[PDB]
Amino acid sequence: EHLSQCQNLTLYQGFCAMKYAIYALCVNSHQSTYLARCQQYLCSIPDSLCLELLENIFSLLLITSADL
Amino acid sequence: AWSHLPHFSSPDLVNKYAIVERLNFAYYLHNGRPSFAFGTFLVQELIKSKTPKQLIQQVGNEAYVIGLSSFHIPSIGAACVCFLELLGLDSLKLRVD
Numbered sequence: 744e745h746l747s748q749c750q751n752l753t754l755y756q757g758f759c760a761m762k763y764a765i766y767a768l769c770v771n772s773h774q775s776t777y778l779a780r781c782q783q784y785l786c787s788i789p790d791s792l793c794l795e796l797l798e799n800i801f802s803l804l805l806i807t808s809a810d811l
Numbered sequence: 812a813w814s815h816l817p818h819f820s821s822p823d824l825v826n827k828y829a830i831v832e833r834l835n836f837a838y839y840l841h842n843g844r845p846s847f848a849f850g851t852f853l854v855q856e857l858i859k860s861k862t863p864k865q866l867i868q869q870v871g872n873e874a875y876v877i878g879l880s881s882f883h884i885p886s887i888g889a890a891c892v893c894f895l896e897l898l899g900l901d902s903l904k905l906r907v908d
Contacts, residue, residue, distance in 0.1 A: 802813060809827065
């Protein structure tokens, strides 16, 4: 329940930080609030989940059309 | 699917983007390192020139392009003349330009 949701919360937080990061990334291609939106959400997230998200951001920094 | 923890050198990605470069003669010429320019050019290419006539003509075309690039600057022009002379071709097209 709540303890289970607490794990889901970091995931929900991960879910919360999930949308904001791409949205900043999304417009930045075809071309900032979304970026901080994740980053702010990223300031107060769990350990392994947020580390995974940062790795994903690094990937986004090291991606191309094939990686897309 | 990026299974391996990748970085600035993900092996599959590294293959996907392995793009290496050698210090081409433009380094010396553009700087202006004449005798070293020809010598390093030979070290890298003379043996590597499986088509010595074709490779020599290509290098000459490159030399002419480089020279034409820098009309005002003196040093580049002098380097162009020396490299053409060491090449083994005519020394009047670049000078005329």
